[model samples]
Each structure stands twice: as C-alpha cells, then as structure tokens.
Target chain A: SELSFNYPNFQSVEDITFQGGASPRNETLQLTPTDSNGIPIRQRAGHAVYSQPFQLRDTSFYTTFTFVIRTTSNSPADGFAIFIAPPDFPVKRYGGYLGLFEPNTATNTSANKVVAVEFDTWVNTEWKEPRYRHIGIDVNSIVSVRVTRWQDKDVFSRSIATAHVGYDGISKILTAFVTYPDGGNYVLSHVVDLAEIFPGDVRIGFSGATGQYETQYIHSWSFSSTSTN
Target chain B: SELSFNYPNFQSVEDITFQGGASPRNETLQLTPTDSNGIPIRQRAGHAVYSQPFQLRDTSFYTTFTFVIRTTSNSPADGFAIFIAPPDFPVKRYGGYLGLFEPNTATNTSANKVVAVEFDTWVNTEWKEPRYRHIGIDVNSIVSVRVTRWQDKDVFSRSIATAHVGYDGISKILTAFVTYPDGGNYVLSHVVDLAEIFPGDVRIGFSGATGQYETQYIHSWSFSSTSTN
Candidate 1:
C-alpha cells in the first residue's frame, strides 16, 4: 500500500503530460485522462484528481511545491488543492475544484480527522455567491475561511502565496501571501496545530477537480526532504 | 457638415426622475444615445463618448452641453473628444481599440477641416499591438476602411443602449444596447432614425470631468425632417 501511499491512481490520467480527463479504474494503476474502463466515474467530466501521501515520521517537517497551471476548456472551471490526512485515504469529492472530502455519514462527524487547503478558482458555497475566485483553508470540513474573506475578518489573518514545510515537523505551520482583486494586498502565516492529530502517521498529498464553470490547471510540482532535527 | 448636428442642452436634471445612466439622448429625433448635458444620462465607469454631425447653414452653430457620467480610476484612464471644421477632417489612429480616431499632430493641417463625428473613451492607438478599449464614429473625417481595425466593420459598428429625446424632428436612426463588467453579456438594438438635430438653434448645454473620464448629456431637442430610410 506504500505505492498507494505515494501516487494512488494512474489510469485516471489521460496523458502522462499531467493533462486532465483521468478517471478511476478497477485494476489499472495509471489514471488515464479519458480511457474510462467502461464503468465510468461518478461524474466523468474531464478532470484529473491525483493524491500521494507521505509519512511525516518526524514531529516537524516542511513540504512545499509550486504549480504553473493553464486551462483548456475555459467552459468548465478547474481547481487544485493540498490536503493532509491519514495514510492510504480514499478519493475526495470530484476533483478539479469541488473536492471537499466531507466525512461520510457512517464516519464520526467530529473535527481534526482531516484538514485541507483549497485554491478555489470556481465560485462555490464555501465563498459567498459564486464569483469564480478566491483561495481558502478548511478544517474538519465544517470550519473554512478563504484567504480573501479571512483578510476581512482579521487584519493579521494568515496569508502566504508560497508555503514551506519546516525541517522540524512538530510545528505544523503554513505561511503564505494572497492578493485580492479588491486592491487589498498583504502576506499571512498560518500554523495548524496538527500535533493534536495522529502526529507521526500523517500523510501529505494533493487533490483537484474541474467544474462546468471555470477549469483550473496545475503545471509542475517538486518537493525536497531529508531526515534532520 | 452632413454628420454634425446640435441639440438643446438640458437645463435641470439632478431633480428629475429619469435614471442618471441609460442610452440615446433623443429617441424621437432619431439621434443615438448621447449625454451631452449634466442631467438625464446614465452613468457608468471607465468612459463614454458620443457624437453627431450637422450640415452648416448660411450661418454657424456653436453651442455647449453637459451630462452625467461615471469614472473608474483603477487604471488611471480617461476619455476626451473634439468637433472640428477648418480644412480636411482628421481621422483617428489605428491600433489597440481606440483606432476609431486619427491622432495626427498637425494643429491646423489643411487635411483636418472637414465636419466629423467623434467619441473617445481612452488613450491608446486604434489597432496597435496593445489596446485601450474605446469606441467612436467619425463622418467624412478622412474616411478609411482601416477603422475596421478598431471598431468592428459591421455596417453600423457603434451600438448604443437607450435613447430619449424631448423634441419633434425628421426621423433619424436610434441604435442602443447594454452590457456589464469588462467581458460579459451585451444586448443591442437599432431603435429609430429621424432627420435633423433637435432644439432648433440654441445649443447651451453641459459638460463634465471626473478625476479623468466624463459624459456629455444632451437634453431637450426637436428635429426638422425625416432622416431614416
């Protein structure tokens, strides 16, 4: 299951180029962008959702990656996100933009089970009236705040366009800056006291989706890590 | 000048029930939506420009008017236009979206004395590499198909939104439409056409300036003949 711990699905991607339209398959490993193995995905609308979880092992660590994305079908909106969870997690909601993995009815509706940071390009309920904009961070699926909206709530709200995982994993802090179309610009830092969750066995990966409104794209990703203090 | 026409400027509009921003300053006179006075005009951001031509009688027609308009300084952009009849009418330049006007430098150049139609919303070339969005129609001001570069070549490229005139005159033509945001939906229509400008002779009207952009509102006017085919 370590391979699942890494890159779970392959048949979901249509092209190795990382372009979208990938769907989940039964036996295949690669997620083809469009070779739906007959039993089509629940919502088969050209979308590429891939996630790979890595063991934190240490009490403190930092992981960071940047993506240069472009959209093809400006029609359907797409989005990307970074998620933190337990190892070998199931597929989140339809990838691209609306992939909020709400806890199943059978699971405990408690908090701290999962945490996600979303770069929402398509407007959704998470943000007021769909404006096809904004980025946000959510905790336990119930409490979430968009970078733009958070800026309005507190002058010191955390926002850092670029985030880095520190060598000391004990301090699970994510810092970044975000710019709003409203002319308000600033930088922010957020520290998710993940120490309360399953500290040593946590997984780190990403999920994404495409909506009928505006499609989002993720270009490239890279991460560097070495055992340390 | 066949295209140059005049209308009586509105006296008092701030107290009127009419909306401040709409289209066609004179629907009855067949003239298009023009806010040449400070009142009875719809105000929108960015910039708005309007112009019409009038044939010179045995005498001269020189008047002034004003209207309500809006402005958007997000980009520090503004608008301006002119009416001329000394020698040959000058044409707008060709580049960006402002190609409707020929920006020649000769102040009293012989090739700049013809009566003309004019409208300017921004500072940029007609069909140049980059563009400043704007629209205008020049009559007999050094005619050229080049204008098609900026203003769409559609038979009547300039479409207005609404028009309301207070006088009786020859039926000219009225065309208008409405749209929002920068690149959203637009509804256009060619209303009616009447002959001659309205308000007979008196041309005292209104003008405005807002940080940068402005609109001219033309008030009550009565045309002389039927100008629409």
Candidate 2:
C-alpha cells in the first residue's frame, strides 16, 4: 500500500503536514485558503508535505491526484504544484515564490535541492517561455528546466482538474499528463536523475499560493513506487 | 430599456468601451482575461464602461448581472465591482485598486467623485472591514463607507455569482443583493447623495483586476435606470 487518500481524514490525516495557510476542509488538502476578510483577496501561501521521505532511486514511480481551484478575485494570482525536495530545502514565503524557497534565493543554485512539477496558473517574470498557462519541471531552482504551455484556454480554475505522473527511476525520465475540467489537456515530460539531486530519500507534498486571494483543493491523491531492480 | 445587454455583440457592442486589458470575449465582457501564457497567473487590470453618461438625478435604478470568476491561482485576487464615477476620474492600475482609482490615492477624499459598489474579494491594507467576504458602498474612495460581510462562507469565487442592485435616487439609498454559486447570499445597503458628488451624469460599468495572473469574465450584463421624477 503506497501513499493513498480519498477524502482525507482532515482532522487526523497521518504523515501529512500543513503550513502557513494550508488546511484540510471539504475533506481534502487546501494548499492555500481564502482570507478571512473574503472581500478583498489578499496574499496567502501554504504547504502540505508528507512527513516521510520516499526512495527515488531503483524505483519506478506513478502518482495521480484530483484538484480544484476557486477564484476569489477577477484575476487570480499564484497557482500550485506537486513537489518533492530534500527536507533541508523547507518551504518559505508566498506569492510568486510558490512556497518553494526563501525570498531572493535562486532555485538554480548548486547548494539547493528541489524537484517540483509546477502547474503554474500565473506567469511570473521569472521565465519568458511559458508566458501564461504552463506545466513546468524544476530541479534545484524556481525556474523550470523543462516546460510546456496550455493552449486550449485556462484550466487552473476548473473544478475537476486531474494530474497523472510516471517516473522511471533508472532512466530518469518523468512524464506528466494533466486534464483540465473542460477537456483542456496537456502532456509534459522531462529527464532527471534524482540520485544526483538527493543523496538518499526526498520529502514530497503539494505547494500553492495566492497574491490577492483564492482557494485551491486536493480532493484525492495516491502515490506508489515499485522496485525496478 | 435604459441600458441593456444579454450577450454583447463583441465585435460591435455599441457604446461600450474596453480599456487596458479589457476585451469582449465569449460574446460578452471579459473584464480581465486569462494570461496568454496560461500557467502562471499574472497581473491584469481592465475596465468596461458604457460610453454614454447616465443621468443620476431624479432616477431610480435597478441593475442585475451574471459574472464568472475563475481561479488562475490558489488565492485569486482583487474582486470586481459595478461602479459609476464622474468620467474625469478614469480607471487605473490593477491589484487592490480594483481598477477604480489611481495608485496610492486614498478613496476618501473631497476632490474624488466616485460612487462604487465594490464586491471586494481580497483585503487590502487600506481598510479594516468586512474581513474576507464583503459588499461595500464606496463614495469618492476605495474604502467602503458602508459594507456588509458575507457570513455564510466566501462567495466571490462561485461560478454563477449574481448581483442585483437598486438605487433610490430620491431616498439616496442604495441596496445590493448578491448571490454566490452555492446559495450563499448577501444584502447590503448604504446612503449616499450623488448630487453632491456629481452635478449631472456619471459613467457606469464594471471594474476588476488580478495582481498575479487570472481571468474574470462577465457572461451576461445588463444595466437599466429610470427617471423617478
């Protein structure tokens, strides 16, 4: 039994950590929540990390999840991501940082170690290629080493957005298939040797944010890794 | 029919003005659009105003409209408003300003002549108000002079959010009835004498924005005013 969750216990979900604005409501993971004021969308940043680190080497991994994003303002701000980083990296700040790193610190630095599949809804000045709707793969930095954009309208606001990911531990190839609520879909892939980024195991979880104010939810999630050796 | 529209012609919606990032899309008004990039929600501020000024003196007005706010980010930002201001003010900046006024200018002022019914989504440091969910009556400023908070959860992000507003020109009482997607409803009232703010007429329309990157669309909007005298 690998990591699996339907509608999480919320009150007593095991191995799951909530930080900043993160909460469990509607029986799911609210990576970022609406502000109490509710009238004016304000800034919110949060993280939900699994307590245990997972093996990244000699394993073939498959994970899938369903998510919902609700808009508080006319133009929502930051999006969310499913990420795995060495425990040392931790989560920091909100806004465009995506709760991934400390303020002003570059993710591309050699001292840092992080691997994230960001389903970015808002385009930051950080990169020019993705422009707007994008799926990005980042290693050790905020900038994506590999990226692709959504062409058939925006999907971040969709209620039943789903994501499927497969990783080949030996080949270091990761593929992601994402579906928006209204049939807008995207497939993105990248190659990464986790062994090179992490000496051993890695912490995994979800990260999201709101510069103005909005809500994002993860209703269901499951993760599994099989030994390939 | 003083001012009415079901779904705008988009290409030839007469007497309608789109400024900055605003456009006519989905055969209706897209006050703020999803970023072209699609992944990262960016900043967008726009205005859709009726080109002709409407008479405010001795007028009883009732306007109802349907709008859809999509979540580009986990925390979407700055909500929209049905506003009427002396044409001289003009719309400006995105984010907390809600495209209502210039940056850094206090909404409470003698020189500023604006009467806006703001459905603020994100709280700006500008005021300590209805907290999260609120409908505010703003006059000559961004801060709500009179406001009511939504007690039944937040409603700004709802899909089929609707607004019904009535203004008693003789009584100088403005009442707003707002409905969220999930049946959460709010009724707020205020008293303001527009005759003191403007001598003759005012521009009426919708205003919205995103500090990051998201989209806000007006699926259908119709505005009407009648001479009570």
Candidate 3:
C-alpha cells in the first residue's frame, strides 16, 4: 500500500497549482469565490491540480473528500468533478463545462484522454430539465457514461460527510459512495476498462465551477494510489 | 448523512452491549484482553453489539472504524469481524471462527443467516497456509464467499488507521477499504445481492476472539446508515 501522493488538507498552498479563479483560503479550497453583494452572475470556475501524474494503469486508487455547495440565492447553477487527465489537458473553462472542457467543443475533437467523475448541480440547456443535480462518470466529453440524480440539502446542518471514490482495475469497476443527508446513502458505479479510455499514464486532479449564479467549495481533499505489483 | 446509530468512541457504553468477555476501557472497546503472563491461552472472545438493528436492504450503509491487534507474544492467533446477524445468533466462540460462527458447523447446516466482513490474522489447520492473515467476506457460516490475504503488520507502529466498509444494494457489491502501514491502501470488493441472502431484517454488531495467544482491540468505532425510501 505505497502511497503515490496524498493531500490531507489544502493548507499547504505550494503543493497544488491553482488555475483560473481557484484559490486556497485559511483551510478550505475555494473553487468559486462568493460575491460581496451576495450574487455571482458571471461564469466563475477554478481547479486545484496535483503537480504530478500518477501511474493509474495496472494500479488501484482511492480518494475520500468532503465538499460543500452553497448558493447566493436559493438556486445554485453548476458543481464540480474529480478527474484524471493527461498532464497537458486544458484547465480553463466555466458554466456547464465545469472547468474540465470547453462547452462548444465537439466530442470527437474534444478527445482529451480525460476520465472525470462529475458532481453536477444545475441542468444545462441540452439536458432541458428542471434540475440536473447528479453524479456522473464522463469518459472524454461532458456526455456521461453513467449518472445518478443528486440533490442539495442540509449542507450546514450536520457534520461534513465523506465521499469515497475508487477505481478497481482487477474488477474493472468504478464505484462512488456518498452519505446523503436525507435518510440513507447513495451508490453509483460503472463497469468499464480504463485501458480502453486513456493511455498508460495520466495526471490526477479536481475541477469545479459555478454557472450564472452558483457557488461550490471543496472543504478538504485527499487521494492515495496502490499498485498490484 | 442521517445516522441510525453512531458510536464514534466507547466513551458511552450505554449504547452498546459488552456481552461474553467484551468490556469497555477508557476509550477503546476491548474485544480480547491480554493476559497477565503476556500469554493468552484461553478462548477469551467478546462482542459489542449495537442495541438496534439497521435497515440494510433497499438502501446503502457506510461504517468507518479503527482497531488494533496487539499480541502478548510474537504470534497472534485470531482476528475480528464486522457482521450483520440475527439478533439471536450465538456470540460465543474463538479461534479461526472469529467469534462469528461455530468452528465445526457446516456451511449448509449452519443456517445462521449472517453476513460478515472478516479481518483474519491466524491460519487454522483447516485453512492450511503459511500465515493466516487475510480479509474475507462471510455469508452464513465462517466459510467465506470471498477471502484475501491480510497480515498483522505494523499495527502498533502507526496511529489508528481508517477502515471504510459498505454494502451497496444498488450495485450489489460489498466493499472494504483500509490503508496499510506498508504505504498504499487495500481494497477488497465482492458482488452479492443482499435480498437473496437473508430475510428482511437483521442485527448489526462486531465480534472478535483469540485462540491460544491472540488479542485484538477496537480503538474507536462509528456507524452511519441511510435509507433509500
């Protein structure tokens, strides 16, 4: 169980590269900053990417994190994602793109060799739904390979809960575990071979953004990887 | 998340039962106590069962725990288990059974209607191995549905580490996550539909035992459960 890298807390600012509007505050990693007037209208997104690429192939990785999504108004716009991408993939964008890809980019041309597990908030025009809060597995494009609905409730009431996400190469399964404030927990999993999606090696990081009037914050993030060999 | 039952520490013993030989120390739940001669030859097994049974079907449940296995000698002969069983299941046994099953019980006739995740340390004569240290998923009898090698390494070196275990009905997978002192982490998962395994309801608790010279401790234990409905 050799750890490739671990960020128990974002208190150390030098360990990560903050792009776009992302910044590290006292303890929390602020993806989208809140407006003074208590209203955010523009597309404000941010990312905190680890400075190194992990050997994800032939190895297993597990991450546990706690995050909070608050809005100036009752309605928040977008959310965030835990992703593993090529070291050189674009780290700039906002709105429905969630800072991981360009909204107007074609899926075929947007072949960035990226694998993202997105926690989306607002419904985009393409989705055409009243709300689209979900946890999804995205291969290379924003189009999800699998998704399950998620809602916002009691964000500040109870203790911050943990979200566990892992990829088991031996079983060829990607699983997510989150404890919901409602009554029970949420589990979303997809069976896919990573070797078919990206090259042998890739970088691991997190990306988050807000839509017209949304806000998202990552209180603390940590990751660890292990190899079968 | 809404927790049906949570005992982050054994400071409050009123919420749990110290039956058989189990007792509560300052903060740790003593499953198997060490003898005065630095040798434990008796079957000193114990159990700390939650007073209530959790609704495990039609929803997902997550539990995080920290435990230690301290031996009076160089070799520890047994381990512990996290199991969901009928409220009336027998809670008196030791050795390779891990206090979850009768040693001589047959898989077909055991008929205890139990589900357990075991962290075994000693290899019994029946198991026939170099060192009997592993993690296993047990259904009904102690004969496991799936088992993986797990040793009693630097347990006393580091501080208590976290073990994340869950049963996801949506995915029909029982997963366990623990970071080893050896560096990285270990993840063991098995696909099993719960509805087909047991009846409707069950009691949840933990049982640990030792053979000739084994001792295990539950430093801190916490449980949280949510419902789908």
Which candidate wins on lDDT? 3
Provide DockQ values for all models, in the order shown: 0.01, 0.01, 0.33
True contacts kept of 3: 0.22
**C-alpha lDDT of candidate 1 relative to the true structure:** 0.32
Candidate 3 local lDDT, B1-229, one digit each (tens): 2346656677777777777767787678877765556555567677888776655567667777787766656666677888877656777577777777665563543456778888776777674333446777777766676665564464333346667777666667778777654444666677767667655566677888887556666767666655544
User: Per-residue lDDT tens digits of candidate 1, residues B1-229?
Assistant: 2223233443423322221122343321111123455422222321122333344232222222222223323322222222333222222332211222334632222343322222333444332312433333233233311121122221122222212111111112121111221211111111111122221322211112222323333343322211211
> What Cα-based lDDT does every candidate model obtain?
0.32, 0.67, 0.68
- Give per-residue CA lDDT, model 2, range A22-117, as digits (tens): 887767888876546644245677888777767666665666688877765556667788988876556676877778866566554675677788
Candidate 1 lDDT by residue in tens digits, A1-229: 1222112233334422222343333322212132233322333223233334445444333333433223333333445566666764545456332454533521233633666666654445542433434455655552343243322322122222332222223334443323222223222234456555555555555555545333232333233332322
Least well predicted 10-residue stretch by lDDT in candidate 3 chain B? B150-159
TM-score of 1: 0.33
Top DockQ prediction, candidate number: 3
Q: Candidate 3 regions off by >4 Å?
A: A1-3, A24-28, A33-41, A101-113, A128-132, A136-151, A156-161, A179-187, B1-3, B33-41, B104-112, B128-132, B140-152, B180-184
| TM-score computed on alpha carbons, candidate 3 | 0.83
Using all chains and alpha carbons, the TM-scores for the candidates as numbered come to 0.33, 0.47, 0.83
Q: Clashes per prediction?
A: 132, 47, 10
Model 1 spans with C-alpha error above 4 angstroms: A1-54, A72-78, A95-97, A103-112, A126-132, A149-171, A177-188, A213-216, A225-228, B1-229
True contacts kept of each: 0.00, 0.00, 0.22
TM-score of chain A, every prediction, order shown: 0.55, 0.87, 0.86
